[PDB]
Structure formats: structure tokens, C-alpha cells
Amino acid sequence: TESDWGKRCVDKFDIIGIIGEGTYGQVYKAKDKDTGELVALKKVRLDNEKEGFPITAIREIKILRQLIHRSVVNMKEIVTDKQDALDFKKDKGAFYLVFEYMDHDLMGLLESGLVHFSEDHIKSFMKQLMEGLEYCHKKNFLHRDIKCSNILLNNSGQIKLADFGLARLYNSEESRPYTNKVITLWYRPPELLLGEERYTPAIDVWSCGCILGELFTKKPIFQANLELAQLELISRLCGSPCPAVWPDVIRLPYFNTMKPKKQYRRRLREEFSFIPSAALDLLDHMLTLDPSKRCTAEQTLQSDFLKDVELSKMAPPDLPHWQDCH
Amino acid sequence: TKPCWYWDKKDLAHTPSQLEGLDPATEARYRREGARFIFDVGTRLGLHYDTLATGIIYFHRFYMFHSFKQFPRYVTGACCLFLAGKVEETPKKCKDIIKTARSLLNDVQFGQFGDDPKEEVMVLERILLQTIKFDLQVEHPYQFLLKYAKQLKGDKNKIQKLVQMAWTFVNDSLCTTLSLQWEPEIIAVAVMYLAGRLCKFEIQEWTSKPMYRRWWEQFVQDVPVDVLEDICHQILDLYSQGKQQMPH
Amino acid sequence: MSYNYVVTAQKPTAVNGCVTGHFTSAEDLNLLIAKNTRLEIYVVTAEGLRPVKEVGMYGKIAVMELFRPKGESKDLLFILTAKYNACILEYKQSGESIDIITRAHGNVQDRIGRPSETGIIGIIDPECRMIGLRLYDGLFKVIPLDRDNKELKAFNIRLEELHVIDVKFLYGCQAPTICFVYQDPQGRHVKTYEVSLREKEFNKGPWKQENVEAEASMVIAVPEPFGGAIIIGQESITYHNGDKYLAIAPPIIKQSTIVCHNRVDPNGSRYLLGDMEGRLFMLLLEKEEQMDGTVTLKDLRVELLGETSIAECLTYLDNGVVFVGSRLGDSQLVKLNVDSNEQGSYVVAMETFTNLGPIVDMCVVDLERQGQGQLVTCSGAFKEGSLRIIRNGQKLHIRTVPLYESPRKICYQEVSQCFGVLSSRIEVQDTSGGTTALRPSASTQALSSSVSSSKLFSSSTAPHETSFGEEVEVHNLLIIDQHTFEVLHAHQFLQNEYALSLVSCKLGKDPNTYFIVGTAMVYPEEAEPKQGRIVVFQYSDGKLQTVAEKEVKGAVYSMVEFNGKLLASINSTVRLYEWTTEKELRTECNHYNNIMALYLKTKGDFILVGDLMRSVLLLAYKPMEGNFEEIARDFNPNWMSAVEILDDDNFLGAENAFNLFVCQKDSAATTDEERQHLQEVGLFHLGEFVNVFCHGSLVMQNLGETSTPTQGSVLFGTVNGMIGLVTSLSESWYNLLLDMQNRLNKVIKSVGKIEHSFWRSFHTERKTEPATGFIDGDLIESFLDISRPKMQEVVANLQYDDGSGMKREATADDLIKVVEELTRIH
Numbered sequence A: 001t002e003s004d005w006g007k008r009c010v011d012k013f014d015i016i017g018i019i020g021e022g023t024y025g026q027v028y029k030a031k032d033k034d035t036g037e038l039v040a041l042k043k044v045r046l047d048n049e050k051e052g053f054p055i056t057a058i059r060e061i062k063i064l065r066q067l068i069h070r071s072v073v074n075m076k077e078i079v080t081d082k083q084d085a086l087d088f089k090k091d092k093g094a095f096y097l098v099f100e101y102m103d104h105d106l107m108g109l110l111e112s113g114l115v116h117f118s119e120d121h122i123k124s125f126m127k128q129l130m131e132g133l134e135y136c137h138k139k140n141f142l143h144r145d146i147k148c149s150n151i152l153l154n155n156s157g158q159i160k161l162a163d164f165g166l167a168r169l170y171n172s173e174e175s176r177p178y179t180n181k182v183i184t185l186w187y188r189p190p191e192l193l194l195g196e197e198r199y200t201p202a203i204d205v206w207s208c209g210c211i212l213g214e215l216f217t218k219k220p221i222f223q224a225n226l227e228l229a230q231l232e233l234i235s236r237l238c239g240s241p242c243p244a245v246w247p248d249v250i251r252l253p254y255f256n257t258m259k260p261k262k263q264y265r266r267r268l269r270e271e272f273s274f275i276p277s278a279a280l281d282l283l284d285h286m287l288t289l290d291p292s293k294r295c296t297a298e299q300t301l302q303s304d305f306l307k308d309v310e311l312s313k314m315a316p317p318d319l320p321h322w323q324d325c326h
Numbered sequence B: 001t002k003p004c005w006y007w008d009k010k011d012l013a014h015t016p017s018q019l020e021g022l023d024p025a026t027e028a029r030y031r032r033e034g035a036r037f038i039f040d041v042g043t044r045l046g047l048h049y050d051t052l053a054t055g056i057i058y059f060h061r062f063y064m065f066h067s068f069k070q071f072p073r074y075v076t077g078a079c080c081l082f083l084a085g086k087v088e089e090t091p092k093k094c095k096d097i098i099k100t101a102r103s104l105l106n107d108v109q110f111g112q113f114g115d116d117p118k119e120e121v122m123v124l125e126r127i128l129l130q131t132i133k134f135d136l137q138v139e140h141p142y143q144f145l146l147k148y149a150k151q152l153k154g155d156k157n158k159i160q161k162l163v164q165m166a167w168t169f170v171n172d173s174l175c176t177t178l179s180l181q182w183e184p185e186i187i188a189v190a191v192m193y194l195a196g197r198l199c200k201f202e203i204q205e206w207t208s209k210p211m212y213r214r215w216w217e218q219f220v221q222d223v224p225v226d227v228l229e230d231i232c233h234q235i236l237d238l239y240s241q242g243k244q245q246m247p248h
Numbered sequence C: 001m002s003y004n005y006v007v008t009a010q011k012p013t014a015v016n017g018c019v020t021g022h023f024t025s026a027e028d029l030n031l032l033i034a035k036n037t038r039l040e041i042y043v044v045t046a047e048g049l050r051p052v053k054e055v056g057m058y059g060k061i062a063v064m065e066l067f068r069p070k071g072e073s074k075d076l077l078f079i080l081t082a083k084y085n086a087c088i089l090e091y092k093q094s095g096e097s098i099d100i101i102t103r104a105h106g107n108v109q110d111r112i113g114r115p116s117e118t119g120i121i122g123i124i125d126p127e128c129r130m131i132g133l134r135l136y137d138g139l140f141k142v143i144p145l146d147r148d149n150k151e152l153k154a155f156n157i158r159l160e161e162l163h164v165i166d167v168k169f170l171y172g173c174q175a176p177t178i179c180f181v182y183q184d185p186q187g188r189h190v191k192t193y194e195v196s197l198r199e200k201e202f203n204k205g206p207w208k209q210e211n212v213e214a215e216a217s218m219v220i221a222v223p224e225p226f227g228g229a230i231i232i233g234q235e236s237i238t239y240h241n242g243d244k245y246l247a248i249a250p251p252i253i254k255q256s257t258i259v260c261h262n263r264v265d266p267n268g269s270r271y272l273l274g275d276m277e278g279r280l281f282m283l284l285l286e287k288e289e290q291m292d293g294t295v296t297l298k299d300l301r302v303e304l305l306g307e308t309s310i311a312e313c314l315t316y317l318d319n320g321v322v323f324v325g326s327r328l329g330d331s332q333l334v335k336l337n338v339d340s341n342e343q344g345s346y347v348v349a350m351e352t353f354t355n356l357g358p359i360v361d362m363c364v365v366d367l368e369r370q371g372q373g374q375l376v377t378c379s380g381a382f383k384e385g386s387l388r389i390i391r392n393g394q395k396l397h398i399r400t401v402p403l404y405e406s407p408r409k410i411c412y413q414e415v416s417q418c419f420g421v422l423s424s425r426i427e428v429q430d431t432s433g434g435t436t437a438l439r440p441s442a443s444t445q446a447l448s449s450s451v452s453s454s455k456l457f458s459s460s461t462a463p464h465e466t467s468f469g470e471e472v473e474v475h476n477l478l479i480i481d482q483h484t485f486e487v488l489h490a491h492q493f494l495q496n497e498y499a500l501s502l503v504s505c506k507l508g509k510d511p512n513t514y515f516i517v518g519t520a521m522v523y524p525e526e527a528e529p530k531q532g533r534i535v536v537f538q539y540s541d542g543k544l545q546t547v548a549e550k551e552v553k554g555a556v557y558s559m560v561e562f563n564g565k566l567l568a569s570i571n572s573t574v575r576l577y578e579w580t581t582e583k584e585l586r587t588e589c590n591h592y593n594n595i596m597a598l599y600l601k602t603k604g605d606f607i608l609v610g611d612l613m614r615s616v617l618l619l620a621y622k623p624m625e626g627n628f629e630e631i632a633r634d635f636n637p638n639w640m641s642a643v644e645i646l647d648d649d650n651f652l653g654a655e656n657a658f659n660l661f662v663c664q665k666d667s668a669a670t671t672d673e674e675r676q677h678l679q680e681v682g683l684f685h686l687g688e689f690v691n692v693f694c695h696g697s698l699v700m701q702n703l704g705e706t707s708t709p710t711q712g713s714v715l716f717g718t719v720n721g722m723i724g725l726v727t728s729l730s731e732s733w734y735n736l737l738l739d740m741q742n743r744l745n746k747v748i749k750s751v752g753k754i755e756h757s758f759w760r761s762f763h764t765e766r767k768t769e770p771a772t773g774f775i776d777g778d779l780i781e782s783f784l785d786i787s788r789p790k791m792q793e794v795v796a797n798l799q800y801d802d803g804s805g806m807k808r809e810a811t812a813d814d815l816i817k818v819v820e821e822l823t824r825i826h
């Protein structure tokens, strides 16, 4: 049946090339021999035998079979290398996680400078992204790593999330120690910069907001190399963490340790005065220092900016495929 | 989409092991020992009750697809627990799991692990994952016992007694083949039903519908008493066979 | 890691801007001409220009303006670089010593902002109270010109109008006032604001906003005698001051877009306008003074003067002389006469300044068997299109071959003693239903001619409607003689067929040498071409014969000969064809993991693929198996403009951000992933747009060993006419030359006080990285030009190291030799 995973061989896919470097394996693009469907195969190596099957892959399998949404990347099946079939111990073969094939990644499109996003385009993009985040946040799973590389878009204008490698469930009533360093520094919230280990789902929201600004500027907002420099940049824009706005900042481990150059005032509305009013309000609330005051996904969808967007419209983003040639 | 992980009691006489010559009593004895091995080992380490159960549901499912005479049970058990730890985010190093096993196992028993215990276990992970059809997410009776108990109102002490006795029955159910016969929701209701009959409590009164004598039907639709009676019979059999008695 | 060296062989020639003033002395009339990264200062004589000074800046010159604040004797110069380096400069001359003073400097980049579509705009107040900058959408940046602002500190005023087309500081206002044309969904509008340095915000503008032509392009500040502004469009010119509104819409300007304006008479009566077809107009402000003593603009008139080179900037100098600054063709000095000549023209050319124009493609060929090498470039565009023959002379000797149509590709065919050149010309839909060319050109002045009769796409049934006046490209293959450069033959391709690739080679066991062209069928409706042809031609006995044609489902962007087979890129696909004994192309094998396979290069059985956005990929032909394999890809994303193979392990690429990078195989077999990961080991900000990489050298007149420490020659051509050279170094030589750069940068004074390290840092809108693996040869070659005190200062405490020891200090007279040897590769 369709459910008997891990047995079908990778022979069934014609390998087209290697689309990307992975965490636990290389990512290959392939075509299904039987259907012609283009798939994306991520390789899982248990030959390392340090810890056997990598947990990063275990999370991506465990979670993505449970989560089904139009903005969540679908794992179609798991296939294997040719079987020795005489002794299982000798087998050093590897497994492949079949995913749907997304045409482009958001970082790629911005870094190639080949995209121009109109207000209406950003609405369709952020609506799908935050609707997907809401599905996951309602299922009590946390992405813990949001980045432009991780949001994939088809040329059709559909958006999908594809980084469940660092995902874990969050229990509201029962808080437990979590890994402090979870997001790429550019999209890491102030709480995790100050080291809060019991983090809310709002860590992902901060990241999605960083993207909202990035789509309007085409340049990431907080570009730093070191954790202190990042807190400084965030502080120059959002304001310095202080009990006046973040009453529990004193409870966070590094508040006395990590001070910015000044106690800055928030300028987010001034430095982004070129953004539409509905969007700026979304950005201002998503980029709130206190995670308990930062808006949730459901609230972001019930915003003047994203509420009245028709998902059917799916205005494709603009790509200039022929003009680029010359 | 997703696989079917439940068989009928009658189908358990056609497990691979039974056909290779293991008698029904022995396969069940092997089933208890392997499950209790998984339980005791994980308890000796620091593991959440869900992690212990996940390993046991894995182990039980495994020997519905393979035979005990070719796969030594304590190696399998150790492998299930090792994977369960990664699945449930309570990870342990394989070497630490092996060490705990040596403390708890006879030298004869540790012989199953062969000359290189860690290798025999790590190598099995490949087979385990393919066997469980890469369906790693598992739900256990525990969450439903609490979800349903929370919706009951009455004497706190009487309600807690039902919860604790039932929680004890769930732990015992892991040793039985029931995890392979009935969904976890049904089990949570069955262990509640048993605690109710033994404590002479009438649960309907605590439910929101006090005149609804079939109290469970407001939690689990379409469950006949037939099923709840079979499950209870199977749980209490473990106590009557053993020298142990109902907790009360 | 990898070590490489990059030098300029020919400096940028295209004119990017030009201004006039009194910069060197309050007395002299100056002409400042800006080429990319280069500033040329001239003094205006009666015969022409006297050059006086030339400086380089560590930046692309984006803004260049002269102004004279109260208290200064002479004009000061403002320059803003494309990386937002701002400075105010002064000319100082002590007898024979000429130097440029940096009076104020700073970087005006904002941490947050959206770069505008129309680009950086810089303007200065008529009272020189402030500098206005339009860097980002929704914002206006003010640098106030007070004596104490030596750092050029500035503040942003919020601008409601997000999409601004053009802005100028208007003349004759009670307060500093800006007049801009902006675009919102309702069309384009002209709106005015007043600027307050005290309040640091805008105030309501002097005159009403009006809604202007949809394609309103340029804003002219009119001198105080008339006041107000003129708005130039595609069809109309309008004057907006207060309640006064004028509009002239002469049919002559509708024909070609006007791109440059300049003021002839300081009163504002006469202005110069130029258009894309090279026409030069006079805009006349016909004045009617009213009885009270006021001067009113009665009407506007436009008069055609003649033809110049397609001009990026115009500047009127004095008497009847005008400097035509051209980016697409040769720049000029032309004289305007009061009387027309017998042809009706008032414009007569005086001097012609060489501009290599955009170098679309180029090849190196030893035309005279000198053992040397000559560079033949595809240079210029439209009526300025030309071939340029370039040979090393100390100067470069350049022959120009006018084409009057756009050249696209060039390849040399020795067997035929001729070049093959792909060209396109502009025809316009005419009343016949066909098209008519604006002027005769190479493809129409060929001795013999032919037209493709291919029936491949003839089934059509796809409607493409034509409106009178719309432009079309007509593409041709030109056969050009290598001695005379006569157009021997011209082959016109199908209607709506674009020629994108050209090779000359033999295939298989076929002894004939062919011209092979790769075409793509372009229809305005298609975002991506879906049809294409590969055409095999033979040039024999003064006629081009169509030998074979292969239909493809895409665009044949690039083709390259590959061990007797034809390797071609068709959209995503990369394909290898065999040439059968029946003289037809047969597909052997394909590669599909590419977004768009824009550039191809080969060496042995290895292939390097340049994608539109997925950077460089190393492919291999597995001869035993007959298929392509993937050696390694650059997972870092870049928009590619040209690629070249340096050696079996190092690969060169050019970004559309004016950057250069080098990728290498990781060559460590610990994991397949390391092997498959190309490592960007070189990063360099060139400052030019590289269109073509070509292996060769023009200094091969010596053709001798023992003349260079560096090995290899990769010449490249750029849009601004700049020609450069890339060569490799040993670890020892690079570390020497690198250590010397850091010493030179501390010693050499930069114009604008721009840090050299910043200038060469890899730069996109999203990243900035320090340069690596590249030696700025133009910095190294400046050691010879610095004064002796500075030279010995450079070599102080400098210990040279090499394999086999030799850890010794070297003197400055030693280095003068080393650099002199490096000045010989170019």
C-alpha cells in the first residue's frame, strides 16, 4: 500500500542533479519514473553510526507526516538504496526522504535580484506563510528556525515551509529546558539572543517579521556576525531591552551581561516610513521585544494587511526570465 | 496515507514466531519479558513514561512482522528504546543503554547481544525503521486517561484513586498484546471502566450527563461494552496468572 | 585557496556624466567628464579641450556636480559613489604640482531603505545651502552645506510619494524648493515641496501639483528670468510655473525618446535636447515681456539641429561648441552653426573621442601571423555599432569598422579568411504592413545577401498583431573580410528570430568548416522562448549555404565546440549533439539541472555552466558511458554575466553586481559532498560589468618566457569599454603583492578619502565581504608613480618569503623592477 514506507527503492527515480547541500545529507532533484512527477530527494546517511539515524531527520519525518497544510511541505514517501538482502548487518545503504519539488527558494530569488514584490505580492506571500505557521502553532509544534532559504515558492505563487529539522513540541502549561541557539542569527529573536531557554512559539513570529521588512527593502534587516552586534542592531531599531517594555528581561540570563551601547528609543516606524500603513502595523507588532507582547499567528491573519487577501488570487511574484538574458 | 497497526486476537496465532514453533504461552512470555526489559531499563535511566511506552509499542509491533527465534528479544528491546528516545526527544546514547542492560541482565541473557552489544543494537535500527513503516508518532492511553479524567467533577480523592489505579492498569497493558488490538483511546476508557467496577464507583455521576449510564460514549464513540469487557478480562488475567493482585 | 591578479589594459571609455564650471580657477572654463571610476578635468579653449588633470576614485561615480558657496573664489566639486561614499573636492595648483583636496567626506548609506527604480539622484540648491539626495523610495536625504559639516552628516525627511521619477531644486524661490515628477496608480504628477533646514521637514509647495504625461521623464529648473520648470516626455514638453501652463507637442519628438538636456543660454531662452536616435534639438523659450516690467514665457518651440552620437550627457561649452558625452558610441565635440549646410544640418563634427562602447562579445586573433594577437570587439549599439581592431603599440592602436547596427557576437574562421558576426537592426512597422529601416547598415550593405526560408515554425496559427510605429529587431549573420572588413555577405534570420550564439568549427569526420548559429524565436507574449533553431551554414565562394537545421524547444543561448561534437544550451537543458555522416545533428546526451543555461565553457572533457541565478556548475562527459555527470556546483547564489575556466580546478565568474569570483574544487575525498562543493576562494569587486571572458594576450609580440612571474591570460570586455586581464599567481608572489598592497594603502592618498579595502569588498544589496584571492594590479602598478620618500616607506620592514627559504628584506629599487615586469603582461 501507499503507507508501507522504507521499502520502495530509489531506482524508481531518475536523478536530475543536486539542488542543495543538506544537514544530514545532500538534496537531489529527481523525476519519478512511473508518474513523471518532479520530486526532491534528501539523503539520510546512517552509515556514520555515531548515533545511527539522525534526529534531525527523525523530527522531519515525525512532524511532516502529522502536519498537512497547503503551506507545509509534503513528505511523499521514504525510499532506500539497493538492498543486499542477505545480511542486514552488512547493509550500509542510505534512505531518501521524498518531498515535492518547489521551483525556487526565497533567498535565491532575492539574492539573484530577480524579484520585485508589489504590496499585493507581499500580501499573498505573508498570508500563506503565517497561515502555515498558524497550522503548526495550533498543532503545538515549533519551527524554531525560520529563514529565507527555508521558505520555498513555486512559480505558481504557492508558498511552503521546509525546515522541520529543528522542530519540537511546546507544552503551554508545562515548560521545560530547550536548546538556546536555535535560529540563524539574522532571524533570531531578542529572547534567544539573551538566552531564554523556555521559549514561546513567538520566536518564529519575530523571524517572519524580519522577512516582512526584507521583502519591502530586499535587504535583511538585522545583519550581524556576533550575538552582541545583533542585539545592538535590533536595539537601534526596536529599542533597547529594559523593564519599561520587557518586564521579564531581568529574568533572562544575560540581561545584566549583554547591554547595548545606549538605551535606544524605538524608531521602527521612522526607519520604515516608506512601508504601507497596514504593513507597518504588522511589522511593528511582529517585531516587539517582549515575546509575551508580540502578536501571534492568528492575530497576524486578523490584521488589516492580511485579513482581506483572497488566497485564490495567488498573484505570482514578478520574475523577468527573458529580459535578464540581455 | 497511514498504515493500519491493529490486528484481531485471532490473528495472533499466525505471528511469525508461532509458525516457527513458539507456543502461544511462550510468545506471550517473551512479550512480557521484552516489554518489562524495556520498561525496567528505561526507568533505571531517566525516561518519560511516553518514551518507555513508545519503545514497547515498537517492540510489540516488530514481532508481529518478524519471529523471536531469529531476532533476540532483549537486543530488539534495547533498539526500540534507543529509537524511542530519539523519537520522543528523550535521547540516550546507545552505550549508556547497553550498560544499563548488563546491570539488569543475566550473563546468559547478555549473550544475545553477542560479542559487540552496541553493534548488534545499532545495526538493528535499519530493520526496526523499515518494519514500523517509518510511522514514528504514537499515542498512548496515558494522555486520554488524563484528558477524560479532567472532564470529571466530584470528590477529588475518589477521582484521584480512579486515575492512579487506571494508570497502573495502563502500565500493565504494555506487557499485553492489547496495544496491538485496540486503539489507545479505547484502552484509557477500559482501564477507567475497570477502576470503576473495582472501586464500586459509578462514573456517570461525575460526567456532564449524569443520566447517561454508558458514560464513556461521550469520550469514545462506537465502543461496545463487549470490547471494554474483553480488555478488562485480558488485564486481570495478568494478575491472576502472577502472584500479584489488583492494586486497590 | 587560490591566488589571482587583475589589471586594467584599457580604462573605461564610456561617458557617464559631464559638467561645466569654474573648478580649476575662478577664471577658467572647465569641462569635467566622468567615466566609470575616472574623472577627467579639461579647460575650454577656442580650438578644443586642454587636458589638465585626471584622477581615479575608489568608487563608481554616481553624482557629479559643481557649486560655489558664498565665500569661495571658485567652484567646488561634489561626488557621490554608487556605494554611497560622499565627498567635496577642491582643485589646488602650486606651480607645477597639481593635487585634489578632500574638503569633506562620509558614507551616507542608511541601514534600512529601498533603493529606487530611477537610481541615485543628486541635486544642489541654487544658493548652495544644501545637497539633496534621492537614494531610497519614500525618503529624501539632506546634507546641509554649513562650514562645520566636514563629515557630511545628513537627515532624512519622510516623503509620501514613494515612486519619484526626477527632482530638481527650482530657481527663484523664497525658500529652498524641490520640483519632482512622481508616479502613483493614477498616473504621473508634478508636485512641489519647500525644504526647511531649521524644522528638518517639508512645507507646502509654491505651486499647484498638476498631472503630467504618463511617460514624463525629465525635470528642468528654469533660470530666474522665467522661473518655474519644464517637463520633458515622450510626446510633449510642458512648462509649469504657478498659474502659468504651456504645452508644445511637436510630432518630431514622438519618434524617439529624449534622454539628455542642457542649458545653452544662462537666461534660459535656449536649451539643448537629445534623443536615442542621435538627433539634437534646440528648445527655445520665446519670451514676451509684459508692460509692467515682468518677463512671461509666451511659447515654446522645438527646432531640429542635426545628428550627433547617441548621447548620454550633453554640455554646451562656448561659442558654437558642444561636448557630446556618449555611452553607446564615440563621444564628440560638434559645432552648431547659425546657417545650415547644404543638407539642412546646423551640426558639423569637430573631433571624435574613441569609445569602445558596450563590448558585447570579442575574440583574439593573430591577423598578421605576428605571433602576437589582435583583439576584435563587438562594440557600440544601434547606429553606433562597430567592430574595433585593437593591437598593442606606449598606447593601444585601434581601428574602427562602422556597422550602423548592433553587433551581438563574433567568431573567427581562419579557413575563410573572414569573421562571422551576429547583428541586429531596428526596423519600424510601416504602412505597407512590413517594416522599414531607419537607416542603411551592415546587414543591408552586404555585397551578396540571403534570407532563411526555413519552414520549421511556418505552421504558426499563433496570432501576433502589429501596430504601425512599433519597433522590431531584425537579426543577421554577417560575413566580414579579415583584411578589408568589407561585409561580404549578410544572412537575415526569420521574422522574430533572434540570433543568440555563434561558433566556427569542424564537426565529426566532416572536413568542412562551418558557421553555426543558435537562434531563439521571440514573441512578446512569451516570458521564456519556447522555440529555437540550430543552423549550420557554410561560407563558400562568396555565398553562405544553409547546410542543416535542427529544431529545438527553447533558446540556444550558448554553443561551444566539444571534441568534434556540438555542445549547446537550450533554456534549462544542456545538450551534446553528434554530427552524422548524413550532415545532420544527432543528440547524444543531456543535462537538465539548470534554471537557465546562459553561458558555456569547456576544457578537455569538462564543461562549466553559468546559470542565471544558480552560479557556476562543473559538468563532465563520461566518455565510456555517453552521458553528462555533475562534478560540483557553486551552491552560493549569484546572477551571472560571464564565466571562464582558468585551469582544471579554478573557475572564474562575473556577477551582475559588478563583482568577480573564483570557484575551486575542494579536492578532498573525505566525503562526496566536499568533492561536489565548489568553494568560492576568490571574491573581488571589479566595478565593471563583464560581458565576455576570452583567453589570450595582445602583448604576445614578445611571445617569450622569462618575462612574467604571473601565468595565464584571460582578457575581458565590459559595458563601459573597459578591458581588463586576469592572471594567476603563486602563493609566495601573492602574499608578497598582498602585503605590499596593505603598505601602499597606508601610503597613498585616496580622492575622497575612500578606503581601498572598502572599494574592492564584494558588494551586493544584500552582502558585503572583504576581497580575497585577488591582487588589485592597478594598485600595485601605482607604486611606480608615488614619490621616492613614499616608495622607501612602502618597503620598510618588508621581508619577502618563498619556498626554499629566502626570508630576506628587499629595497624599493628592487620593487620598481618587480612592478615594471608586471606592467608588461598588459
Ligand SMILES: CC[C@H](CO)Nc1nc(NCc2ccc(-c3ccccn3)c(F)c2)c2ncn(C(C)C)c2n1
Pocket: A018, A019, A020, A027, A040, A041, A042, A073, A099, A100, A101, A102, A103, A104, A105, A149, A150, A152, A162, A163, C593, C594, C595, C614, C633
Ligand atoms: C529547504 C532546503 C533547501 C532550500 O534551498 N533545499 C530545497 N529546495 C527546494 N526547492 C528550491 C530549489 C533550490 C535549488 C534549486 C537549484 C539549484 C541548483 C541548480 C538548479 N536548481 C532549485 F531548482 C530549486 C525544495 N523543494 C523541496 N525540498 C525538500 C527537500 C524540503 C526542497 N529543498
